[PDB]
Design a binder for this molecule. Structure first.
Ligand SMILES: [Ca+2]
Ligand SMILES: [Ca+2]
Ligand SMILES: [Ca+2]
Ligand SMILES: [Ca+2]
Lengths: 559, 97, 143, 159, 684
């Protein structure tokens, strides 16, 4: 009786005792401990977060010629302080050492110079032109003094070891190469050719090999820690995808090196004629892409069973998506401007494996994520990755000939990945007929009002009466529709979110398929696949336009 | 150190010898401790302020009240008639003033 | 300084966490209570908890150490306030007197599986006054 | 130009021996009826003794991934290194597996290898691993390669 | 230089900037490059002095600011606690602030910047911080002559650089570093604050002594290792250990970077002469002991020490074979850095385990070179080093009572990939078995020639005991690597697989036989003096404790027949021997203490958790009756500790509770004349 009553008062008392253990107010701590904690907290919260902008002024002052002709020169114009600093940094790199020693002076001044370069709603064309000219001036202020040679010498001396020095050098190179700076590209290419430097490409290949990817074991250990209750001491859970910024910077540097269809440097990357040893950067990029797609497929297979993707895995997927997107952009820039050598190198590479893996991942994640509403941003990132992959595939076929090897290899890849592309194409057709359905008069008679926010039951009856959609399509669209308890859904946002990504990616796929079909006329494996893709081609037929021109290869090309 | 007619090489050598035999040990000891700031919690520490007076004018570097812990300054008299070996610890004394 | 009855109240509370009865609350022994209340404590946290209270450093809280931290908490009158708070939330009827009718709801609330007819039979001795309905006065004597 | 091992293809597991300083080439064999154990048929001396491949031929049914196999157990394709495969004895229709009972062939740790009727379970599945350093996980397995099979159930190499 | 001398000499450097509140100072005199380098050094020192003043002012402000903040939090706590109840304090995100860790609390309090206003501190307290932070920016210059050292340096460096082309890379570097410091005033504080610590006035002398010892140790880096340098190392490390600041302030100890210095003095001595073996072994021993104690001081110390887990693994084989250096080796340092810390155990990676597995395989394949040099009989494998390599994995895979699955699964896979790590008994071909290997170890320990080198006393490794310890450590590691019971019950396929592999590796019969092997008992001699068999040679109770742990965690006792057979063969003899060693003379023997520890730590808890299996034991009456009487007699012991007595009480109260009434008549007959004594032993 009373003991049972005590048991009732025990659960009340159990919380009180554990609460009095747990509750540890700051005022109980001695003065010195609290003072030390305040010093640390003040540092992190205020001093580190305090920001000031001085790089542009500092670089301008260092670049001002300090009245040398007024000074007692009696000879050649003395180099400006910025020129001397860049020369010091270049000589330190050219000095032979076993390892690239970490230098805080370089790691700070490279950042200062990169910020001085970049210095970064609707605006006038005059405003954009002035921004372009000012960026050109700021980049000239450094590559006139020899920063282009320095950013190559440091990479060569790196010997393929990833580190903060290489991370700063890559950012400086990107800053001086932004906008496809032709003068800087020419300076780098001329320097490399005249020095016959093999260490640059050797270090590039080493850095590519050292670049990291997704880690199932690390992610599972982190998730077990979180489940047990451990707090992430590391800032962003960077054990998975160790360096996301470094890989993106490394591939952005190479893409900027080839911007503007710089055929000379594109060919020089594939083969270094003068150098004794040649390294195929174009193939190394494909190898890294093949590893990245394996990592992405690994997370797909991990999260397929899970009902919902948690926020940690969602951000890891995001980071992997930007890495893969940058790699596809770099490959596209390699092969664009009908670079026949690069096209053949990719055609004989392992790129098809990466493409067929991404096709499966894309076909399944489209179905999985569309049902949920919390993964809209992830779905958009995936759509953008799909679009970039299809753009690279289109550049793969640029300058094609009838019955070429590249076209046959694409046809073989498509036959291998037939099922996934079939799913992708049904998805696109399903979300492309939605615009016609919502623009039909039957939708207007179901919702005569101008607000248009129709009930879910009314939408289901409308889609049943439209009878263009089967029962499976109707239930899939119901699952992909997320409405409140009032059943009222915003068809505007629904159709736009599921239409414009479909509208542009499907157009890219239709263009790729038309190109393949026309350049490989008699291929039964291709005609069956076209029959499978009939609906999308019919939808995009009015929009697709084709012409014939006499291309740079002295042959008739179709655009 | 004083002589104005001494050869430059011998002058530099004697300057280096004076620094090494008497000063280098403690100079290195303080250089090794500069980048650490262990300041006790005392009234002198509380009295310290950023600016010497009301107007925000920087004071002369160095002068002021510094309460941060510093290595202690040890010297021993170099006498060769004493037979004690405790003099070997620490650097020989010199007329610092 | 602490009342001898409050010592006895801290006796029973101390033994509440000390199931094995050895007078020492280990980290795992404390951890079982926290998990029973729904909270998932890390092992490192549990050590930090006990270390702050363990003046001896043996890693297990003793009663004299438990009293010192009891004094550190200003639980001067919170004990009967919780008892009074328990009485009102127990009296879901709100009449100020808890009836055997509500006793069937509260047995499910805690999760106890004691049978209802016995609960009425115990409530005939729990009610020494006998009211057939427990007030605050009959609540405190039960506690 | 070079072909790859593919599902629904008949294959024979081939191993070499160095007994008394000569290379003897032996295939894995198993008789469906009667003895479920697996023995070795010598195909090196094909000139004097005809090999009996009718009980050495095996069929590659599935090449599911390791993760797909976890999920499947919890509930034409090209073979890739690091995938779980199912091998069916062509003559008997029973699958190669670790019997989990040992005849004590001088090794207590070793397990017998035989044929099993049921497809369910873990003993039937084997994981292909790259013996050569050139090959890597995820790479297509060529028609001619050296392979090291690993039993999923016991993590014991086909030895 | 103090006061007026500094004033005069700064006026000599620059009359204009440093005038007290025409003439050209040392700066504007067209100086040679070596002189310019030294002026750069002087200007660096002036900036360092400014940074020190700027840090001391911040610490001065922190005192009263933190005092006001603490008073405010006391008041806010009182106000919140008035309305709420003690039980509801677990709830109430209201009181979540007070339940947060102090670092989180103070980070939450210091959120005044911007206008998110989620911080609970009032505006009047906010004002002092918002004024100090702008005064600090003004003093940093981050808010017409130069009139300041910062602007003076910024002008002078640029003027020199544009005046002449400097041919000295050192001068160029110094000038540009100084310019970057002038333009990055925030970075000076960002570097200084993490190295800033505050101490009370009472501990000033102790802090000064600790700093002097640290200074000696640090300055001794520049000199090469030698006898006197080793003496000074050891003396300074002893002083640092004895000082109480080393305990009370681990954060200051990390900020000073002592562990890095101790490793560097260890790195140099270990790397110097790798081919010619480690010199100054007590040096490495002292360094490793200091590093282990540093790990044990605090958890953050342990995390900092964990970052050098790699190097310690290549240097793990420094002094493994040498006796009396237990706990003073780099492997011991690694074990201390990874010991009982789940965060670090999960962060531990596969290659680190692979390195240890490779070392253990090498030790199992190859003999011990210096042991066979000293003349110990040659055997194919190295138990002495194998045991330590196994102990490290035991600490790696098992943490705080239950096993780390991720680490255990990797360790088991590596061990089965390299089967030679198990030892000659368990290689698989011609393996006599664990039980036969342990009787062979008994025979070796009994024979003088095989046990000893047969060509100080602690240096004599008893080979039989080494073999027993190796096998016990291996069995302990595998049992700890066994999966937990909840995963097995849930049906985790990986856990089932691991528990099957371990079962295949170790048969149950061998474990039962090893448990059935009996000890040797101390005996009273003719004169009455007790002769006690040596601990270091022969069969120890810990060896059977490892087997019991393996049997409980892998095979499990779920059948009454198995439980009764095991009680018949292995447990009852040991219990009755302990009950016979209860004489006042034999109680203090090492045999008796070890046996009591073994029983009350391994056997009795197992029989307590297997209590329900004792329900239907009518046919086995004599066995259970003997168990009850023996346990009661053991409880009547004197040398037993409080925990041991409590464990015996729990086991007896469980077994008696499960037994039927007819079983305990004989125990009741013993109790009816012991309970009436009403002594201390009558409570149970
Ligand atoms: Ca206890
Ligand atoms: Ca205690
Ligand atoms: Ca009521
Ligand atoms: Ca009543």
């Amino acid at each position: 009786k009373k003991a049972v009553w005590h048991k009732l008062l025990s659960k009340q008392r159990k919380r009180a005792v554990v609460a009095c253990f747990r509750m540890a107010p700051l005022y109980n701590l001695p003065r010195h401990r609290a003072v030390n904690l305040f010093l640390q907290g003040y540092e992190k919260s205020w001093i580190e977060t305090e920001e000031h902008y001085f790089e542009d002024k500092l670089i301008e002052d260092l670049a001002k010629p300090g009245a040398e002709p007024p000074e007692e020169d009696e000879g050649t114009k003395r180099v400006d302080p910025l020129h001397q600093l860049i020369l010091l940094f270049s000589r330190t790199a050219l000095t032979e050492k076993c390892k690239l020693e970490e230098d805080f002076l370089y790691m700070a001044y490279a950042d200062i110079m990169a910020k001085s370069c970049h210095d970064e709603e609707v605006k006038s064309f005059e405003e954009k032109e002035m921004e372009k000219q000012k960026l050109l001036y700021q980049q000239a202020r450094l590559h006139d003094r020899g920063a282009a040679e320095m950013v190559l010498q440091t990479i060569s001396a790196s010997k393929g070891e990833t580190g903060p020095m290489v991370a700063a050098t890559l950012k400086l190179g990107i800053a001086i190469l932004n906008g496809g700076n032709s003068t800087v590209q020419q300076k780098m290419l001329d320097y490399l050719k005249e020095k016959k430097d093999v260490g640059f490409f050797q270090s590039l290949a080493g850095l590519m090999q050292s670049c990291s990817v997704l880690d199932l074991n690390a992610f599972e250990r982190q998730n077990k820690a979180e489940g047990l209750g451990m707090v992430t001491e590391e800032g962003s859970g960077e054990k998975v995808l160790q360096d996301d910024e470094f890989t993106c910077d490394l591939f952005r540097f190479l893409q900027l090196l080839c911007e503007g269809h710089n055929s000379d440097f594109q060919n020089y990357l594939r083969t270094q004629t003068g150098n004794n040893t040649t390294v195929n950067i174009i193939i190394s990029t494909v190898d890294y892409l093949l590893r990245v797609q394996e990592s992405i497929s690994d997370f797909y297979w991990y999260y397929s069973g899970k009902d919902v993707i948690d926020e940690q895995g969602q951000r890891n997927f995001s980071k992997a998506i930007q890495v893969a997107k940058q790699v596809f952009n770099t490959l596209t820039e390699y092969i664009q401007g009908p670079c026949t050598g690069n096209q053949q190198s990719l055609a004989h590479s392992r790129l098809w494996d990466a493409v067929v893996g991404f096709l499966h991942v894309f076909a399944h994640m489209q179905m999985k994520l569309s049902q949920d509403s919390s993964q809209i941003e992830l779905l958009k990132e995936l759509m953008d990755l799909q679009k970039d992959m299809v753009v690279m595939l289109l550049s793969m076929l640029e300058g094609n000939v009838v019955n070429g090897t590249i076209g046959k290899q694409m046809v073989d890849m498509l036959v291998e990945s037939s099922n996934n592309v079939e799913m992708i194409l049904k998805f696109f057709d399903m979300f492309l007929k939605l615009k016609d359905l919502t623009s039909s008069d039957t939708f207007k008679e179901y919702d005569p009002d101008g607000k248009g926010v129709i009930s879910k039951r009314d939408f289901h009856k409308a889609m049943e009466s439209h009878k263009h959609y089967t029962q499976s399509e109707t239930e899939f669209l119901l699952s992909c529709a997320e409405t409140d308890e009032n059943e009222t859904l915003d068809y505007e946002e629904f159709v736009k979110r599921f239409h414009e990504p479909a509208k542009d990616i499907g157009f890219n796929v239709a263009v790729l398929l038309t190109n393949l079909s026309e350049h490989m006329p008699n291929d039964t494996r291709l005609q069956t696949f076209l029959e499978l893709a009939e609906s999308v081609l019919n939808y995009f037929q009015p929009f697709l336009g084709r012409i014939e021109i006499m291309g740079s290869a002295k042959r008739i090309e179709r655009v | 150190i004083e002589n104005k007619y001494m050869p430059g090489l011998l002058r530099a050598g004697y300057y280096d010898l004076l620094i090494d035999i008497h000063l280098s040990s403690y100079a290195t000891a303080r250089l090794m401790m500069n980048n650490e700031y262990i300041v006790p919690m005392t009234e002198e520490t509380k009295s310290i302020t950023l600016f010497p007076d009301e107007n925000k004018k920087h004071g002369l570097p160095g002068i002021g009240l510094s309460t941060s812990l510093r290595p202690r300054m040890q010297f021993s008299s170099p006498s060769f008639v004493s037979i004690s070996n405790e003099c070997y610890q620490y650097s020989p004394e010199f007329p610092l003033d | 300084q602490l009342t001898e009855e409050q010592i006895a109240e801290f006796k029973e509370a101390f033994s509440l966490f000390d199931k094995d009865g050895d007078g020492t609350i280990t980290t795992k022994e404390l951890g079982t209570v926290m998990r029973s209340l729904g909270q998932n404590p890390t092992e490192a946290e549990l050590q930090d908890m006990i270390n702050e209270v363990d003046a001896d450093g043996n890693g297990t809280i003793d009663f004299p150490e438990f009293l010192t931290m009891m004094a550190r908490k200003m639980k001067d009158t919170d004990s009967e306030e919780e008892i009074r708070e328990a009485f009102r939330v127990f009296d879901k009827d709100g009449n100020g007197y808890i009836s055997a009718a509500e006793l069937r709801h509260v047995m499910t609330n805690l999760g106890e599986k004691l049978t209802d007819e016995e609960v009425d039979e115990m409530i005939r001795e729990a009610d020494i006054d006998g009211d057939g309905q427990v007030n605050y006065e009959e609540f405190v004597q039960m506690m | 130009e070079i072909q790859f091992l593919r599902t629904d293809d008949e294959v024979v597991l081939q191993c070499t021996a160095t007994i008394h300083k000569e290379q003897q080439k032996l295939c894995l064999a198993a008789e469906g009826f009667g003895n479920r154990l697996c023995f070795l048929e010598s195909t090196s001396n094909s000139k004097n003794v005809p090999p009996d491949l009718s009980i050495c031929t095996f069929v590659l049914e599935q090449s599911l991934s390791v993760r797909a196999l976890q999920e499947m157990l919890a509930n034409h394709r090209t073979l890739l290194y690091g995938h779980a495969i199912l091998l069916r004895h062509s003559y008997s229709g029973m699958y190669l597996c670790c019997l989990s009972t040992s005849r004590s062939s001088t090794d207590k740790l070793a397990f017998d290898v035989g044929l099993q009727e049921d497809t369910t379970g873990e003993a039937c599945w084997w994981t292909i691993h790259p013996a050569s350093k050139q090959r890597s996980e995820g790479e297509k397995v060529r028609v001619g390669d050296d392979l090291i099979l690993v039993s999923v159930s016991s993590e014991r190499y086909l030895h | 230089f103090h006061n007026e001398d500094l004033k005069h000499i700064l006026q000599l450097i620059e009359p204009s900037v440093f005038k007290e509140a025409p003439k050209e100072g040392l700066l504007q005199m067209k100086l040679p490059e070596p002189v310019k380098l030294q002026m750069c050094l002087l200007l660096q020192y002036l900036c360092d002095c400014q940074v020190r003043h700027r840090i001391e002012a911040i610490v001065a402000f922190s005192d009263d600011f933190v005092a006001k903040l603490q008073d405010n939090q006391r008041f806010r706590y009182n106000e919140v606690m008035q309305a709420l109840n003690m039980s509801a304090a677990l709830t109430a995100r209201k009181t979540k602030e007070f339940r947060s860790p102090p670092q989180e609390q103070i980070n939450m309090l210091l959120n005044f910047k911007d206008d998110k206003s989620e911080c609970p501190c009032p505006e009047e307290i906010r004002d002092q911080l918002l004024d100090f932070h702008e005064d600090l920016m003004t003093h940093c210059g981050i808010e017409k002559k130069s009139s300041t050292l910062q602007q003076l340096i910024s002008e002078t460096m640029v003027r020199w650089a544009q005046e002449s082309v400097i041919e000295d890379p050192e001068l160029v570097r110094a000038m540009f570093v100084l310019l970057h410091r002038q333009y990055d005033g925030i970075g000076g504080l960002v570097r200084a604050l993490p190295k800033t610590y505050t101490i009370n006035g009472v501990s000033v002398e102790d802090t000064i002594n600790l700093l002097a010892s640290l200074g000696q140790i640090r300055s001794l880096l520049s000199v090469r290792m030698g006898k006197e340098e080793e003496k000074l190392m050891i003396r300074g490390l002893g002083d640092i250990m004895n000082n109480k600041v080393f305990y009370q302030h681990p954060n200051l100890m990390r900020a000073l970077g002592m562990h890095e210095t101790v490793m560097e003095v260890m790195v140099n001595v270990l790397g110097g002469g790798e081919s010619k073996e480690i010199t100054f072994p007590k040096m490495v021993a002292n360094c490793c002991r200091f590093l282990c104690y540093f790990c044990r001081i605090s958890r953050q110390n342990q995390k900092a020490m964990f970052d050098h887990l790699s190097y310690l693994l290549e240097n793990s084989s420094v002094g493994l074979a040498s006796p009396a250096m237990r706990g003073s080796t780099p492997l011991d340092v690694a074990a201390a850095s990874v010991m009982d810390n789940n965060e670090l155990a999960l962060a531990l990676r596969e290659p680190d385990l692979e390195k240890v597995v490779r070392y253990l395989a090498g030790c199992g394949l190859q003999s011990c070179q210096m042991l066979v040099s000293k003349g110990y009989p040659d055997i194919g494998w190295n138990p002495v080093e194998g045991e330590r390599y196994l102990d490290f994995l035991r600490f790696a895979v098992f943490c705080n009572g239950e096993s780390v699955e991720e680490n255990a699964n990797v360790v088991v896979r590596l061990l089965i990939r390299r089967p030679e790590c198990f030892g000659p008994a368990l290689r698989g071909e011609g393996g006599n078995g664990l039980l036969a290997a342990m009787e062979e170890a008994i025979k070796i320990a009994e024979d003088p020639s095989r046990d000893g080198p047969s060509p100080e006393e602690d240096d004599t490794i008893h080979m039989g005991n080494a073999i027993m310890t190796f096998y016990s450590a291996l069995i302990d590691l595998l049992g700890r690597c066994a999966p937990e019971m909840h995963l097995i019950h849930a049906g985790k396929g990986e856990a089932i697989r691991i528990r099957s592999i371990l079962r295949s590796l170790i048969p149950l019969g061998d474990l039962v036989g090893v448990i059935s092997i009996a000890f040797q008992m101390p005996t009273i001699a003719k004169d009455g003096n007790v002769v006690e068999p040596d601990m270091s040679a022969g069969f120890c109770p810990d060896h059977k404790a490892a087997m019991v742990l393996f049997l409980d965690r892998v095979y499990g006792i779920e059948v009454q027949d198995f439980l009764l057979h095991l009680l018949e063969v292995g447990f009852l003899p040991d219990l009755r021997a302990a009950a016979s060693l209860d004489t006042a003379a034999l109680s203090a023997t090492d045999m008796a203490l070890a046996l009591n520890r073994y029983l009350c730590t391994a056997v009795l808890p197992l029989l307590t958790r297997c209590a329900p299996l004792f329900a239907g034991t009518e046919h086995h009456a004599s066995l259970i009756d003997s168990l009850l009487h023996t346990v009661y007699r053991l409880s009547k012991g004197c040398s037993l500790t409080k925990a041991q007595r409590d464990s015996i009480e729990v086991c007896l109260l469980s077994i008696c509770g499960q037994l039927r009434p007819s079983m305990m008549q004989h125990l009741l007959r013993r109790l009816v004349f012991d309970v009436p004594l009403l002594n201390e032993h009558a409570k149970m």
